[PDB]
Amino acid sequence: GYDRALSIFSPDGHIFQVEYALEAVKRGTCAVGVKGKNCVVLGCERRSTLKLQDTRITPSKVSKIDSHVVLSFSGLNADSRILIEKARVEAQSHRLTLEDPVTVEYLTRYVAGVQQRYTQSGGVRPFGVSTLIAGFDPRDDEPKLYQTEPSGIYSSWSAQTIGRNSKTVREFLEKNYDRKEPPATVEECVKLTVRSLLEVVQTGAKNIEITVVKPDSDIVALSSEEINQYVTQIEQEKQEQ
Amino acid sequence: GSRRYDSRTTIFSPEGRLYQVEYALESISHAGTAIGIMASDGIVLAAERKVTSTLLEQDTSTEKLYKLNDKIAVAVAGLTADAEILINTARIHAQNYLKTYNEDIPVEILVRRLSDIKQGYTQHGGLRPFGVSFIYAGYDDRYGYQLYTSNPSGNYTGWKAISVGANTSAAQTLLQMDYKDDMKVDDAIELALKTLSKTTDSSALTYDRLEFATIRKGANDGEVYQKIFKPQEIKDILVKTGIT
Amino acid sequence: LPNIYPSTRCKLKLLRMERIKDHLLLEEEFVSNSEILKPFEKKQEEEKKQLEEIRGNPLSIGTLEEIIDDDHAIVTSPTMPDYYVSILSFVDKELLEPGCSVLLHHKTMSIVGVLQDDADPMVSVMKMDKSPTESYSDIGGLESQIQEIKESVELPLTHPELYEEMGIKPPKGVILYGAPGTGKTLLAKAVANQTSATFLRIVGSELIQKYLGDGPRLCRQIFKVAGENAPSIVFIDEIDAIGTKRYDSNSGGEREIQRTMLELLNQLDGFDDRGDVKVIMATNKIETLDPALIRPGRIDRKILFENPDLSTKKKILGIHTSKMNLSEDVNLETLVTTKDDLSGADIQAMCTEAGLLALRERRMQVTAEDFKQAKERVMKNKVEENLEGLYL
Amino acid sequence: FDSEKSGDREVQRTMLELLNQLDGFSSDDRVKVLAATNRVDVLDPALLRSGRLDRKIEFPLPSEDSRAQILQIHSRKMTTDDDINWQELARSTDEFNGAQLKAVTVEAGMIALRNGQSSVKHEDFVEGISEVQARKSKSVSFYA
Amino acid sequence: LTKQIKEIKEVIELPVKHPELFESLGIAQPKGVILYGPPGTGKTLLARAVAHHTDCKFIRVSGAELVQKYIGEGSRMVRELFVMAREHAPSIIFMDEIGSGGGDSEVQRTMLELLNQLKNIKIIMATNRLDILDPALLRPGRIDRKIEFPPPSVAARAEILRIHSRKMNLTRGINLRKVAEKMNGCSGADVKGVCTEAGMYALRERRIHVTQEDFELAVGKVMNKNQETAI
Amino acid sequence: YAAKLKQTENDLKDIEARIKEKAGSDTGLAPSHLWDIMGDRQRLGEEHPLQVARCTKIIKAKYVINLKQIAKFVVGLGERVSPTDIEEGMRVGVDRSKYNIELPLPPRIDPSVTMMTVEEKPDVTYSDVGGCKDQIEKLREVVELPLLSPERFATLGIDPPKGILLYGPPGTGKTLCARAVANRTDATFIRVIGSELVQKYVGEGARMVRELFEMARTKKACIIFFDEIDAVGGARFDDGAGGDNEVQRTMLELITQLDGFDPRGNIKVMFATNRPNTLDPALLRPGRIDRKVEFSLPDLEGRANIFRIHSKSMSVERGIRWELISRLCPNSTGAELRSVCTEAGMFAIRARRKVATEKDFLKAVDKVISGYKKFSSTSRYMQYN
């Protein structure tokens, strides 16, 4: 039906649709992820403009693609869960075709490929989402964290954040996280992720959601009564020092 | 050349939001208001039909509340014409789910199917997005009562109390103070009626322009009773709420 | 006469005005002696008598048109047949700008003076003649934006030494783009408060005139007036008005608006090489602006304004409620510092509404109930938003 | 044109006066009127009628030999050479309209002067052809 | 209009009459008010009465071209009225209503911008409804009070008919409440039209007093004309 | 001691008032004198009042004079002017009483066409413009060379091109390259902004252009800088409503003046625009525009030259890598490089450092090129070109 090209090379070389999707992502909720020796933590915030949103049926910001690999996004929430559905069905097809649980690298490559194709195909605007992929490969304990941009470029990050005010979280991670010396415990990773969030969220312990990913098919979602527990000693150690 | 007449519906703005869904979210505000309250015993859906006159038929007339399944009912806020196709597709999807699994379709599945339908048009095809937002209510053994909402953007979130349509902010502010976690059906109904009275643009509250849909669970367990309040029973709750 | 230090009584102060009188009397004595030595018959104040008798009366008023063969000119009075008036020696041949108002003699009609306009029939409204009120203290937060605006508009005028030593021409113009009701106009009031320069405000609507000709005419007049009264801090506001609206009173339609915008984009940069004319525009919709205006070299530092955060909200509450007849029952900590979204305009609007409500009851003190009622009143009277649904 | 909003009703006065002077009660039949427009698709139908301007001579773009004749005419004052092939130059210019050939001559002379030559050659003329033409950008021989 | 005048007084006259009051509560003096409602309901009467009793000159500009035409002088932009009004203070600028605002909503915001910086002048603008207006006007901080003039009720219609009926010779015992109760839909200016038409009807029979049944004739004619001209 | 203070303050005002009164808005300067009382000698000659009036048909001798609105007298000479010095269209200083043709006067020129003549030669030079060597060479060969050394053009017997376009993206150097010409020339440099040629009353733009060209022809050698001709540049088109036909009228008057039934007369004219697409093809036709310069975005070497030119001043730290700075700034017009230099200077000031280093320039270029990218002009206007 619609064959008109929507992504056209600008006279300065950039693609206007892709660089507009960059800003569309820049207005999304902040999402941050860090990795330890054997633990990767995906931290995220929620919108506090409106209240009376329950927790049980509210769609989780971090969506489970498989038992060993999880995904978190930022930006336009509408389009991101489509990528989630495509990634899940592709993972099942990969299980059928290769008799092997999917790897983080392959899934991230597929997501970058589908975003690239939508930037390529005519009549379709590029995705306005930016995704974070975390998990553990089968029989491997190494946490892998991957970021996928709407432009289609993917890279590994020891600690990356996306969304609004991502510059502040980036510079915070640039000095309170060491790439060569990652935190050695799940508690330390969670504490770093939480302390990173208060630099932007500035209250909102109710709408701070954190997912901890562990090897051997272990994915947990810390509830509020533990997040506020971490926040207690974090704010206790903040002002007194 | 068939280019100058194109409007480029699916185009990113210089700052970076879509423009057609932006104006759909304005078209929503110009439609009749709807209210949805999540109570412990059930869910109450009420809406005030717009453009009312003495010649409007009320005996058999439902334009804002629609039935998709014996357990799941929805509230329409926006262009009824565009909502009709979505309602038909939702009913088809629910019946196909009953075909495939022979078990009642959970609300989240249908909500996703409709959100995907909206998103498909907001993404490609170059067609205008649907200018309708839904309010989903239903029951199951998974999470109990569920109360979602939809948008022309195709995003859905869970809500303990929502009101999409005209004067959304006023209705939300009014309901948030009076909302607790322990009402029965009657308390939610009277709260919704008071909110509609305090948000309407007319003077009084006559039974002609109010529609009610309630979800109740009594002696029978596992099956709720879906009743669309007819005008004869509609005029009854007016005296109970004191508005009369 | 000079200024006098110190303010209070002091013997050195008395010595200072003693020097003042000593020098003044010495000038008076020198002038008296010089005059007395001069040949009064052509000196003293007989020059005034000669000037008056040569000038004749009454002196008519006309318009100059040329300075051909100086000591000759072609005036054009509204009724006279455009004589070939000769220019006398008394007039200053430097103020005879083609188009001025000369003073013809009544009978012989020879120019005996130039009448300066000094009218400013429209500029007087434009010319900032009394500082509005608010200083930079009244702005809560926004420290980065204040610093940028200072180093762009204030420091070049008050303290040019840093820039001349550094060797950089100061940033020409600044555009304050941001969300509506966030202090984009307050900051202009602040920079107008402390200023050593004329502050000619203009709003983009007034450039959308009705006649075809007077679209660029107004802009040319505004920037000429800014140039002559150097330095100038011209404050074109609501610059997006030219793009949108499409007023029926405008005879040209879109094309006349385009010509007016072209004249603006020229006068800002110009071939004329204007001097110290700083330009500060502010708008809500930066998107609908032809990028010729916002191009670097015309307005360099594009300051972004953003809705205040919780700490900024509490600071705004504190500064705005500083002049409050507040009862202790009101708690500022939970007053509006709720994190449920506000703006720089809402905080003042609710204060004004609550003050009005307290006036209605004739209660000289402010109650927490009245503050809460005004809070909810402002909340209902609020077009919430549209784009949040995309990310909701 | 009919208009209630606003119009150019002033110029139409002159147009109708010209129409009445060309034809009507006054003729005098001894005042020929030439007119050289550029956009004949805009002229009012009354002004295009007979009785008024009758002959409508069409001026087409020069033919192939016409281009050679134009180049020969406009290269008299300048110090040309004796080896310039006018036929080749005329063929080089394709849909060149009149003054676009005088511009070619001027550009060729300017190039010859810039390079220091005391008289133009065929190479200078070709360079001028490339200068005047839609190759006003030229440069960048990338990917042919 | 009992409540409407009640807030109009405290928003317009109270600042001008008692400027010292708007200092102890620490609130800026309100710049101006917005009055809306169906046409012919008193939107200029409530402004004129307050401008009269508060003793403020009542300027009623309704367009730049008309202002320049009436004052007979050239002007490029509308602030020429502002300098001329500053000399004669206190004063009230009243702009009416019936493209984008025809300039009536333009000059409103142009005046409101200048008055933010320029100060005992208030602006009252009368409109027909509150969604055709520019959102800049509706922004808080700018124009403050949004006052409703709903179409008069039966009691309000009776009061208006009584007020405008104390201008002609009236036969004893005219049940004006009955006539107003018969008058449905008509509002404000129609009442004055009814009274004037009744006065004319009394003349037509060469009589000396106005009667109730002549009031019936007048109200019937006014209703017929009002419902016909709506076509 | 205030008893002293009172008359201490009083004496100031009393003495200054006394001095002002004893020593004695519309005059020249008494201290400069020069207002001698010999003006009675140049005053008794009542011939100074001379009615101005435009002459008309020369009755073979009797002259018809058309005093603006007093009369339409028919008048002879006044013995102070040769009989061949008066011709139709000239303005005559007609004597007041017993009217006579005394003194011919220069032709009437509209005042509004007078200030559009630069007598305040701007502060730029050809050294300032960088990365535009070929374009500046073409501009020179068109405008400056014919006046400076016309002998070569006579030797070759060619007519140098008269008329040159300066199309390009905004903020590339068009107005700069015209200001440089204005500074480095010796001929009059009448400047015309495009919007100025749009008056209110119908047909006034045609008079504007006609009087402008007459003034230009009055001088021996003149350069006209029609600028932003995008304003009066609309291509001829019809829409039924007669849209903006007055601007079209002005444009055709200009086109006829440039090349009509009469040669131009050494009136070399420079145009300049940011959207040359919307120009009527008649203007683009050679004869009124010969060369079409292509001021475009500079390359890496152009960027380096721009940085060197705009950083000749400034306390730059020695050892800065200008090549690296130029490379990390792709497809940015020279105005953006100037803004980068200004912001680099500014960032050092905010940190109180008196010398801006490479680390400062990198931050400034990141902020300007990357941060202020959404508000960029060189990406839309490139399409128009």
Ligand SMILES: Nc1ncnc2c1ncn2[C@@H]1O[C@H](COP(=O)(O)OP(=O)(O)OP(=O)(O)O)[C@@H](O)[C@H]1O
């Ligand atoms: N940070 C702040 N500190 C103090 N007052 C503030 C602040 N932000 C906003 N305000 C108040 O908000 C009021 C209204 O906002 P203001 O007029 O400055 O906004 P604007 O965006 O420039 O206006 P507009 O959108 O109408 O062009 C001002 O009178 C000012 O007192």
Ligand SMILES: Nc1ncnc2c1ncn2[C@@H]1O[C@H](COP(=O)(O)OP(=O)(O)OP(=O)(O)O)[C@@H](O)[C@H]1O
């Ligand atoms: N090649 C260059 N050499 C030196 N400076 C340059 C160069 N190119 C641009 N600039 C700088 O950028 C500006 C040149 O553009 P200018 O301000 O003259 O406007 P413009 O290009 O004529 O604009 P517009 O097309 O919008 O009318 C000057 O401020 C100048 O310092």
Ligand SMILES: Nc1ncnc2c1ncn2[C@@H]1O[C@H](COP(=O)(O)OP(=O)(O)O)[C@@H](O)[C@H]1O
């Ligand atoms: N409530 C009222 N009381 C008295 N006179 C009224 C009333 N309403 C309208 N009028 C009459 O109508 C006129 C004012 O009309 P108005 O309501 O201002 O119309 P608009 O607002 O459309 O200009 C006045 O001359 C007055 O005599």
Ligand SMILES: [Mg+2]
């Ligand atoms: Mg503002």
Ligand SMILES: [Mg+2]
């Ligand atoms: Mg320029």
